[PDB]
Amino acid sequence: IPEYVDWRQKGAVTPVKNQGSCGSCWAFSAVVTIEGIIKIRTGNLNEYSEQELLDCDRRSYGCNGGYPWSALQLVAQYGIHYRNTYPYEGVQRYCRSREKGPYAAKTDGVRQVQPYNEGALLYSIANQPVSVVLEAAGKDFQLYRGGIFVGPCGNKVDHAVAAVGYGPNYILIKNSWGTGWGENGYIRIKRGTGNSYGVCGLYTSSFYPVKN
């Protein structure tokens, strides 16, 4: 795998989103990976519905949090609508999948990256954007403005984001806190520190969709 990956430069990343007050990071993370794999496999970059996962992923808890794995399993078993068809409202509502016409995209499954393994995550990111989790509660992460973020942070992961690239010393993360946070909505998180958890627990739980 190459020394640098940046899926934005390959046209596989849609504009940075803002989840707002809703605890929907898990759906935004999943959607970033779906947008990415659909671009990688089909050549078209589309926006897909975080709101649909929020409403319809029965294993998740709406705006009270959820599981990227479970949203990706929802997209593989059923599908997902375009963001235009099923726009983001920042609140959980009734599942309206059935009323929004045929799905726009469908995946074939969900792999997990071997956790606590930097190279395994890097290998996956080289193939596609990956849903990853981290500790975002620390004021250092909340107030991050730029540079390669080293913490301070623990490994008490509580926030789902998407890895869309990496470099020699960092992993490139698309956050869902709007374009004004971090580096136009992104954070580069230091890697290669030898901490198996990853900085901020970044290697705790990583999933990506499979699409044949």
Ligand SMILES: *[C@@H](C(=O)O)[C@H](O)C(=O)N[C@@H](CC(C)C)C(=O)NCCCCNC(N)=[NH2+]
């Ligand atoms: C993240 C966010 O929107 O900022 C959000 O709080 C979230 O989904 N967090 C996850 C943790 C990471 C994905 C590791 C989470 O807490 N998932 C489990 C949901 C817990 C909610 N349970 C109940 N009973 N309300």
